[PDB]
Amino acid sequence: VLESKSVVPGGGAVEAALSIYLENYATSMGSREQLAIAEFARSLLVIPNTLAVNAAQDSTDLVAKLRAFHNEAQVNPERKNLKWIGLDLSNGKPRDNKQAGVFEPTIVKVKSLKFATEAAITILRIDDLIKL
Amino acid sequence: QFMEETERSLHDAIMIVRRAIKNDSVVAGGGAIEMELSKYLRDYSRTIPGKQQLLIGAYAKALEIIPRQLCDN
DSSP states (O other): OOOSOOOESSHHHHHHHHHHHHHHHHHOOSTTHHHHHHHHHHTTTHHHHHHHHTTOOHHHHHHHHHHHHSSOOOSSSSSSSOOOOOOOOOOOOOOOOTTTTTEHHHHHHHHHHHHHHHHHHHHHHHOSSOOO | OOHHHHHHHHHHHHHHHHHHSSSOOOTTTTHHHHHHHHHHHHHHHHHHHSTTTTHHHHHHHTTHHHHHHHHOO
């Protein structure tokens, strides 16, 4: 918080807000690229699964209900029963930021998404390992 | 061999135009409607679910195969 005053409300709430935002972008783009963006969007959804796992919660139930609270894409403590915001590490319920939601810093979220893309390209590339 | 399909064209013509008289409501062909329903069911998929998202989205995806296959083959 002290280094970078810019921080981001939501942990698994951002990822799920982001899943529809990318797909909204995907519908507008059209062509071959609409499906590629869509699949990026499905992988954001692992984040709400991984926390469900640690909590011992249902995974599929847990992401569904977070996307159910929606107006526009934007995460905020203003609404939680009509917009995404927060999680808990022991429940899938949304929470406000004066309550018990999760936040992340800006830096931890931008560096992770990116790093994971450069990795995704490298493993996908190969079509050998064989002794020539 | 050519006649077999040309007969089928005239036959497809008679059925469908008749079925147009009978049900005067007519929508766009081409599998055009289905892409809009995929999208419509995708919008509701977002709104509705306590677990329903996987299954309503399955219904939506399912629609799109029908014109997509004709492109693909």
